[PDB]
A and B are shown apart, each in its own frame.
With several copies, the nearest count.
Chain A
Amino acid sequence: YPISTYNHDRVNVFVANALVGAFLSNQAFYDLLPLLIVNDTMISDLLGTGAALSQFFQSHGEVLEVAAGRKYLQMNNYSNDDDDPPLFAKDLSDYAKAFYSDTYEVLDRFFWTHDSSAGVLVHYDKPTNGNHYILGTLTQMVSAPPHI
């Protein structure tokens, strides 16, 4: 991409993060590459997929599933000391799953059929990349010594 033509055009943040992740993991990012500059809307490029890449994100008929992971990263000198800072299980493979879509009515019509065993969390104020939910998994936090 040249900077001169693409001086002030938008992107999918999802495509950017999955692009740098596929480049660090060496997982053939080039099909994901031309979906960088977004079209008129934010999510229709995800619904009409360039290449379906279920290792990063899968579609579900107006509801996009993504796997947001690794807000933090543990260094090897971390040894679960109580004076060390906590991590809140944000360094595992997939601590949760996010369901980005348009409207909460369509998302709750999806949740009629979707499982809700582990609870679902919202943000309701100003979401990161559009209105979504949080589906945590059964991975647990260990770094607190009495409590799990």
Chain B
Amino acid sequence: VLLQRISPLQIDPTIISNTMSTVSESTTQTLSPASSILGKLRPSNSDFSSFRVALAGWLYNGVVTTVIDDSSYPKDGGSVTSLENLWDFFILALALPLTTDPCAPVKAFMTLANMMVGFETIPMDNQIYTQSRRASAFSTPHTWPRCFMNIQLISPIDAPILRQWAEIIHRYWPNPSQIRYGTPNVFGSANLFTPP
């Protein structure tokens, strides 16, 4: 509430309605992709506290971690053959990099892999966890597949769009940085592992 009441930024969700404008809704053959993402977003919601708490978690990396709700993951796995599952992949992949969770890129990669069970295959570790395990199970860093670390394990002839997805994850992920604050000379600092 403090970052909100100090921020110059206010949100109108009506920008998305301004872009789409959804002139047709009574059809029954299917839904438009525009109407589908409007119903998926529901911009009539005006609660945005999760954005502020996700911003707040950067102060508190050390004791509390910010992960994504599994209800926002595509249920039952989800294939790429389905429109709203593709939209849910877009929502998750766009929302992800603001979190303090460490294995977020591996979540992003296995989300597309589980979207693409049965069309493009990746190499395996053993016959325990197959390709179609959920992305929600990836929390610790002992569950990252070796094909995710080494780019050359995904051959660019059987899984092309998976190869380029992992490529874009590795090259285009936002790097960390640092700034400073306060004065240590007449304050001290409660910094423990960072410089003070």
Q: Is chain B in direct contact with chain A in the complex (CB below 8 A)?
A: yes
Closest partner residue, chain A, to B121 (CB atom) = A26
B-contacting residues of A (Cβ < 8 Å)? 22-23, 26-31, 34-35, 47-52, 61
Interface size on B, residues (CB 8 A): 12
> Is there contact, CB below 8 Å, between B126 and A48?
no
A-contacting residues of B (Cβ < 8 Å)? 121-127, 130, 146, 155, 157-158
> Is there contact, CB below 8 Å, between A26 and B122?
yes
- Per DSSP, chain A at the interface is loop
> Is there contact, CB below 8 Å, between B146 and A52?
no
> Is there contact, CB below 8 Å, between A30 and B127?
no
> In the assembled complex, how far is the CB of residue A91 from the closest CB belonging to chain B, in whole angstroms?
22
> Is there contact, CB below 8 Å, between B123 and A29?
yes
> In the assembled complex, how far is the CB of residue A89 from the closest CB belonging to chain B, in whole angstroms?
27
Instruction: List the A side residues contacting B155 at CB < 8 Å.
Output: 48, 50
> Is there contact, CB below 8 Å, between B157 and A31?
no
Kindly list 13 other residue pairs between chains A and B, CB separation below 8 angstroms, not including A27-B123, A61-B124: A27-B121, A28-B123, A28-B127, A28-B130, A30-B123, A30-B124, A30-B146, A31-B127, A48-B121, A48-B123, A48-B155, A50-B158, A52-B121
